[PDB]
């Protein structure tokens, strides 16, 4: 499949490149037009410049349920093995695999061969999860996250067992174009639920920090609903998106990256407008 | 604010650092500006400039040829 996979990658990158070019043309026309309509002033740099909406990789989101594989870094800690066990229950149909002396590239080829849709890798620091990598395997995007405030079900006594049904999804706070891009990657990890499902999973954006919450609700009576929090609780902060798979750091391009040493980096946010 | 008719206008100071010679409630002489046009880096819609303060030209004060009387 070396020859076939190379051909499909080139045409995919070709179509992606054209979409970016036409959008950049729109922004230049839009920013130029609004400036003169204001009639306030003409920036000198503006003077110098003047003188398939659905993502291509996500063909098959609605037709078939996603298949998710979860693994860790080599020689996992005790608590990291518990966290990967909980993430398996969060995602319907997910599977968790032991990472032995497995090369990263060897994992990706096995996942592609068996039709695994998405691959999750989690890192830890002194027994607490600190990083998460989400990769869409058929040459899809790879997103890199850092975890901030992880609270596990194992820490909390006598919770019980979860509903494990297909949950409803809530996306809140994602307004910019990048935020729309990010929320798509998180949403497509989940299958199409049922209308009468009582399981709710929430992604809420606040100053480029994404909060993950898991809940089940019961309607005792009209207009009054009671929420009981279940499942792990953590925060996500994106810092990089790459076009290729996680076997391709050295060749894939960067769609978006966070730049913290910029003179105005402190006061700027990218997931909201 | 013009003394003759009480209107309030916006004028240009020729150079940054001539603002130091001008204080509030001072008396200045104002001439027209911008009939020819507005240069790059000039705010459109301002049609006046400051020429003298206390009957002394701003260039003479800037060049250190005269001192402002109080």
């Amino acid at each position: 499949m070396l020859r076939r996979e190379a051909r499909l990658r080139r045409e995919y990158l070709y179509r992606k490149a054209r979409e970016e070019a036409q959008r950049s043309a729109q922004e230049r026309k839009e920013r130029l037009r609004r400036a003169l309509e204001e009639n306030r002033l003409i920036p000198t740099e503006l003077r110098r410049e003047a003188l398939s909406h659905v993502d291509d990789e996500y063909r098959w989101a609605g037709v078939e349920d996603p298949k998710v594989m979860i693994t860790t870094s080599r020689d996992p800690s005790s608590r990291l093995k518990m966290f990967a066990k909980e993430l398996k229950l969060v995602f319907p149909g997910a599977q968790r695999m032991n990472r032995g002396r497995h090369e990263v590239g060897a994992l990706v080829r096995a996942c592609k061969a068996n039709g695994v849709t998405d691959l999750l890798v989690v890192h830890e620091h002194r027994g607490t999860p600190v990083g998460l990598i989400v990769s869409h395997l058929p040459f899809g995007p790879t997103a890199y996250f850092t975890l901030c405030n992880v609270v596990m079900r194992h820490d909390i006594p006598d919770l019980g067992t979860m509903s494990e049904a297909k949950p409803h999804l809530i996306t809140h706070g994602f307004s910019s174009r990048l935020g729309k891009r990010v929320s798509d990657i998180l949403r497509y990890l989940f299958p199409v639920p049922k209308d009468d499902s009582h399981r709710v999973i929430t992604f809420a954006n606040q100053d480029d920090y994404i909060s993950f919450r898991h809940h089940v609700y019961k309607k005792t009576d009209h207009r009054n609903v009671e929420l009981t929090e279940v499942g792990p609780r953590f925060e996500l902060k994106l810092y990089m998106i790459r076009l290729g798979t996680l076997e391709q750091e050295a060749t894939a391009d960067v769609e978006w990256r966070w730049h913290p040493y910029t003179n105005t980096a402190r006061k700027r946010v990218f997931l909201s407008t | 604010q013009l003394i003759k008719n009480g209107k309030k206008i916006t004028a240009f100071v020729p150079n940054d650092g001539c603002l130091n010679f001008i204080e509030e409630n001072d008396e200045v002489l104002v001439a027209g500006f911008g009939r020819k046009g507005h240069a790059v880096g000039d705010i459109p819609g301002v049609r006046f400039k400051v020429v003298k303060v206390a009957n002394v030209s701003l260039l003479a004060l800037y060049k250190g040829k005269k001192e402002r009387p109080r």
Partner: peptide, 29 residues
């Protein structure tokens, strides 16, 4: 290099007025 720059300076002068600059930007739009 200096000759090339001086040719652009004449074009920069050829629209150096404020109304001239806004003139093309509507026209390019």
């Amino acid at each position: 290099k200096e000759h090339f720059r001086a040719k652009q300076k004449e074009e920069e002068e050829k629209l150096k007025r404020q109304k001239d600059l806004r003139k093309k930007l509507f026209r390019i739009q």
